[model samples]
Target: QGSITAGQKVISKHKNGRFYQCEVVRLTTETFYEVNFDDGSFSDNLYPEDIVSQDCLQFGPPAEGEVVQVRWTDGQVYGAKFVASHPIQMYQVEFEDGSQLVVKRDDVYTLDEELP
Candidate 1:
């Protein structure tokens, strides 16, 4: 079992046998939580076993040409492409607006997986 709190971004294991991103909405019970997916689906009985800590998801340095969703300097999420990995663990990504930035690894998320 693990600990989770409301207002956190957590990973939920779905019935399809895959993990997806979800937002903790509330604690439904001592052992359960209500979580919402980005697509508007939600669950009210997510068990501790059904959740994965956000800290555990690893995005080994993204590869060039990979599509990603990255948080920009303004705190907005944008669709981008991983162009290169920096020497200091930073990543260079090109956004739809044609701007690029060298950002931290945590700022980039691969687009292969759909948000639940």
Candidate 2:
């Protein structure tokens, strides 16, 4: 039931075994699509199983520059700005104290969200 259309944002698991943000470029078949990745890469034979539509993602990854909370290595949570993500893989966040950290998706939360 994961029907998708052109121009829709989605997450595609790349050959490197990580999920990356992508947009459906075109429908190549009833079950295949051409998707353009945020990193300037494109795949033309992606099956529905290869990507997750934005609507289906739970607590979707934060956008660049969005304010979020980060759980640090010392087990304390701090307010931070989402810098960027490796596709939807690891993310980098900038804290108020002018420091930054590279973290996983689970280590970040939208301002209104609770830590996992």
Candidate 3:
């Protein structure tokens, strides 16, 4: 049931506690795929069936010259720059003040794509 859909961003978690932000470069099945990372690197044979839907994956993190929103699980929201997605499903978010937090995806209420 998997088909490759280009430009679809995806987050993948590995068994070794490594998390990667990848774009769906190719889809082999509804639950399997090949993905390209933010750094332009690629990996094949990523099986989504092994992961949970709400298992905490991040596609894009905020960067310079971008707008982003972060909502915490407790209903608190913050606007910040996108940083990196950690293995545990928490985001490494950077504020204007240079402070950062490792926040969970469930804690995030919304994420507005700031990139074109």
Candidate 4:
């Protein structure tokens, strides 16, 4: 078992090239590390198999014309293109059907937000 020293930046990978950059706060073993995300939430005891490292720019708030897609809990798919500038983490999306929704980074699915 190895330990992730505090202050190490790590990446948590999800399927489909989606991932988040996090800073290690604690380490339980070689395969498990605790981390805090950019959203200010802490995730404890994550396995190495659950993540990978990569170099990418962190996403800032969406600008006008930026597109996003989401899947609802009710099995419906929604999409929105940004029409205004807003904070990176706090923003609203308008669905294709004209329904609007406000979402935070944590509100959407961590893995796939548009999965059916």
Residue-level error in angstroms, candidate 3, position 25: 30
What is residue 16's positional error in candidate 1, in angstroms? 54
- The digit string of per-residue lDDT tens for model 4 on 39-110 reads 344444433222223111244334444444323335553453333322233223333233334333343332
| Cα error of candidate 2 at position 83, Å | 1.1
Per-residue lDDT value at 69 in model 2: 44
- Give the alpha-carbon lDDT of every model: 0.40, 0.41, 0.35, 0.36
Superposition error at 4 for model 3 (Å) = 32
Could you report the Cα RMSD, in angstroms, for every candidate shown? 21.8, 21.1, 20.3, 20.0
**46, model 1: CA deviation in Å?**
33
lDDT digits (tens) for residues 13-95 of candidate 2: 33344444444444432333344444444444433333333321345445654544443335554454444333323444443
Please tell me which model should have the higher lDDT, number 1 or number 3. 1
Clashes of each: 0, 0, 8, 2
At residue 30, give the lDDT of candidate 3.
28
| Candidate with better lDDT, 1 vs 4 | 1
Count of backbone collisions within predicted model 2: 0
Candidate numbers sorted by lDDT from highest down? 2, 1, 4, 3
Residue 80 in model 3: lDDT: 37
| Candidate 1 lDDT over residue span 1-116, tens digit each | 22444454544543344544544444432333344434444445433333332211253344445444543335554454444332233334433333434333344344344454
Question: Predictions ranked by TM-score, top down?
Answer: 1, 2, 3, 4
Cα misplacement distance, residue 80 of candidate 4 (Å): 25
Q: State the lDDT at 68 in candidate 4.
A: 41
lDDT of 3 by residue, 35-86 (tens): 3434444334343222222232353223332434434334554443333332
